[PDB]
Design an enzyme around this catalytic site. Structure first.
Site, PDB file in Angstrom:
ATOM      1  N   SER A 111       1.033   2.912   8.548  1.00 45.99           N
ATOM      2  CA  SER A 111       1.109   1.628   7.837  1.00 45.99           C
ATOM      3  C   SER A 111       2.422   1.346   7.121  1.00 45.99           C
ATOM      4  O   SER A 111       3.183   2.299   6.950  1.00 45.99           O
ATOM      5  CB  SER A 111      -0.144   1.115   7.155  1.00 45.99           C
ATOM      6  OG  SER A 111      -0.631   2.067   6.204  1.00 45.99           O
ATOM      7  N   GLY A 112       2.832   0.075   7.067  1.00 51.87           N
ATOM      8  CA  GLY A 112       4.171  -0.294   6.587  1.00 51.87           C
ATOM      9  C   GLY A 112       4.994  -0.650   7.812  1.00 51.87           C
ATOM     10  O   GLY A 112       6.080  -1.246   7.662  1.00 51.87           O
ATOM     11  N   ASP A 127      -0.373  -7.643   1.771  1.00 44.98           N
ATOM     12  CA  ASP A 127       0.093  -6.260   1.915  1.00 44.98           C
ATOM     13  C   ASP A 127       1.499  -6.227   2.481  1.00 44.98           C
ATOM     14  O   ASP A 127       1.719  -5.879   3.648  1.00 44.98           O
ATOM     15  CB  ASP A 127      -0.870  -5.437   2.807  1.00 44.98           C
ATOM     16  CG  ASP A 127      -0.581  -3.948   2.741  1.00 44.98           C
ATOM     17  OD1 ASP A 127       0.131  -3.505   1.813  1.00 44.98           O
ATOM     18  OD2 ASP A 127      -1.306  -3.159   3.421  1.00 44.98           O
ATOM     19  N   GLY A 182      -0.371   6.949   8.128  1.00 44.67           N
ATOM     20  CA  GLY A 182       1.069   7.250   8.208  1.00 44.67           C
ATOM     21  C   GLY A 182       1.858   6.285   9.074  1.00 44.67           C
ATOM     22  O   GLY A 182       3.091   6.379   9.051  1.00 44.67           O
ATOM     23  N   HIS A 197       0.811  -1.218   0.000  1.00 39.69           N
ATOM     24  CA  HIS A 197       0.000   0.000   0.000  1.00 39.69           C
ATOM     25  C   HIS A 197       0.855   1.284   0.000  1.00 39.69           C
ATOM     26  O   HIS A 197       0.493   2.278  -0.653  1.00 39.69           O
ATOM     27  CB  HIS A 197      -0.929  -0.006   1.221  1.00 39.69           C
ATOM     28  CG  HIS A 197      -2.208   0.762   0.907  1.00 39.69           C
ATOM     29  ND1 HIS A 197      -3.269   0.774   1.750  1.00 39.69           N
ATOM     30  CD2 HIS A 197      -2.590   1.465  -0.231  1.00 39.69           C
ATOM     31  CE1 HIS A 197      -4.311   1.408   1.139  1.00 39.69           C
ATOM     32  NE2 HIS A 197      -3.877   1.853  -0.070  1.00 39.69           N
TER      33      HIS A 197
HETATM   34  C1  LIG Z   1      -0.322   2.003   4.877  1.00 32.65           C
HETATM   35  O1  LIG Z   1       0.585   1.276   4.435  1.00 32.65           O
HETATM   36  C2  LIG Z   1      -1.060   2.803   4.016  1.00 32.65           C
HETATM   37  C3  LIG Z   1      -0.385   3.396   2.982  1.00 32.65           C
HETATM   38  C4  LIG Z   1      -1.063   4.285   2.124  1.00 32.65           C
HETATM   39  N1  LIG Z   1      -0.370   4.980   1.139  1.00 32.65           N
HETATM   40  C5  LIG Z   1       0.813   5.612   1.423  1.00 32.65           C
HETATM   41  N2  LIG Z   1       1.005   6.072   2.688  1.00 32.65           N
HETATM   42  N3  LIG Z   1       1.548   6.232   0.455  1.00 32.65           N
HETATM   43  C6  LIG Z   1      -2.444   4.461   2.267  1.00 32.65           C
HETATM   44  C7  LIG Z   1      -3.143   3.803   3.307  1.00 32.65           C
HETATM   45  C8  LIG Z   1      -2.443   2.998   4.190  1.00 32.65           C
HETATM   46  C9  LIG Z   1      -3.258   2.309   5.257  1.00 32.65           C
HETATM   47 CL1  LIG Z   1      -4.839   1.770   4.812  1.00 32.65          CL
HETATM   48  C10 LIG Z   1      -3.320   3.072   6.569  1.00 32.65           C
HETATM   49  O2  LIG Z   1      -2.938   4.253   6.604  1.00 32.65           O
HETATM   50  O3  LIG Z   1      -3.598   2.318   7.643  1.00 32.65           O
HETATM   51  C11 LIG Z   1      -3.650   2.957   8.920  1.00 32.65           C
HETATM   52  C12 LIG Z   1      -3.273   1.953   9.983  1.00 32.65           C
END
Ligand SMILES: *C(=O)c1cc(NC(=N)N)ccc1[C@H](Cl)C(=O)OCC
Ligand SMILES: [Ca+2]
Length: 240
Positions: free
Chosen positions: A188-189, A93, A186, A45
């Site tokens: 996620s990852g 993911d 911010g 993501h």
């Molecule tokens: C998390 O990896 C993520 C990444 C993105 N895109 C980038 N930040 N460029 C969008 C959404 C998300 C997920 Cl759904 C998120 O923010 O999860 C919150 C825990």
């Protein structure tokens, strides 16, 4: 992280900030974990956009000079062959990033320890989420690394209709769901650090939260279960 506390400088040294070249600046977009001196594990993501990426290690304050940072380009991006942007519920993911340099390890910069393949945590297992994401639903990023204590919620409970039901797969981990602390945009990852056999290992890659908001009761933060992908990780690294 919602309901976090500031992390001590040297507690989570495998945490990285994944940043993109934003105009003429660099913006924090995601977290990640350093797993090799030249490999980062994050969420797929995070790389769905075709951006210029960099990784920051030994980072504590996004907006100040810690005196400990290393800034490295991404040389290559490997997303999981089954990842699909439009179907995050499907899982897969996870992304691996090959760095343009190997970083230097120190007290601020260490590798993330991964679980053994197929390992599943017992319900209500002791874990911490870390990241610089939103400290409230629709809030702003944290300046300093935040941590939150986030017990696991087993698949049995997590896939119950009251919780996430069918949206969650056995390839995921759920943690938290108290309505007070969570991951948020911010984060996620990033890592979920769980204490096992007296050592913190990285069991999750932060994936999603409720559309309703970040800290929602009986909506745990959901993670990619790292121990599902161990062969995959090792195959990619071997072959890149
Ligand atoms: C998390 O990896 C993520 C990444 C993105 N895109 C980038 N930040 N460029 C969008 C959404 C998300 C997920 Cl759904 C998120 O923010 O999860 C919150 C825990
Ligand atoms: Ca800094």
């Amino acid at each position: 992280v919602v309901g976090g506390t500031e992390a001590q400088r040297n507690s989570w040294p495998s945490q990285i900030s994944l940043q993109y070249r934003s105009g003429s600046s660099w913006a924090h977009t995601c977290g990640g974990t350093l797993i090799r001196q030249n490999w980062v594990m994050t969420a797929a993501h995070c790389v769905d956009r075709e951006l210029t990426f960099r990784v920051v290690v030994g980072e504590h304050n996004l907006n100040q000079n810690n005196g400990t940072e290393q800034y490295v380009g991404v040389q290559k991006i490997v997303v999981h062959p089954y990842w699909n942007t439009d179907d995050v519920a499907a899982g897969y993911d996870i992304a691996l990033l090959r760095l343009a340099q190997s970083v230097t390890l120190n007290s601020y910069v260490q590798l993330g320890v991964l679980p053994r393949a197929g390992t599943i945590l017992a319900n209500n297992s002791p874990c911490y989420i870390t990241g610089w994401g939103l400290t409230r639903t629709n809030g702003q990023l944290a300046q300093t690394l935040q941590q939150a204590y986030l017990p696991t919620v087993d698949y049995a409970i997590c896939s119950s209709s009251s919780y996430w039901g069918s949206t969650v797969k056995n390839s995921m981990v759920c943690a938290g769901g108290d309505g007070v602390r969570s991951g948020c945009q911010g984060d996620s990852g990033g890592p979920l650090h769980c204490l096992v056999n007296g050592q913190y290992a990285v069991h999750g890659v932060t994936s999603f939260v409720s559309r309703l908001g970040c800290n929602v009761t009986r909506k745990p933060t959901v993670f990619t279960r790292v121990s599902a992908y161990i062969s995959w990780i090792n195959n990619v690294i071997a072959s890149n």
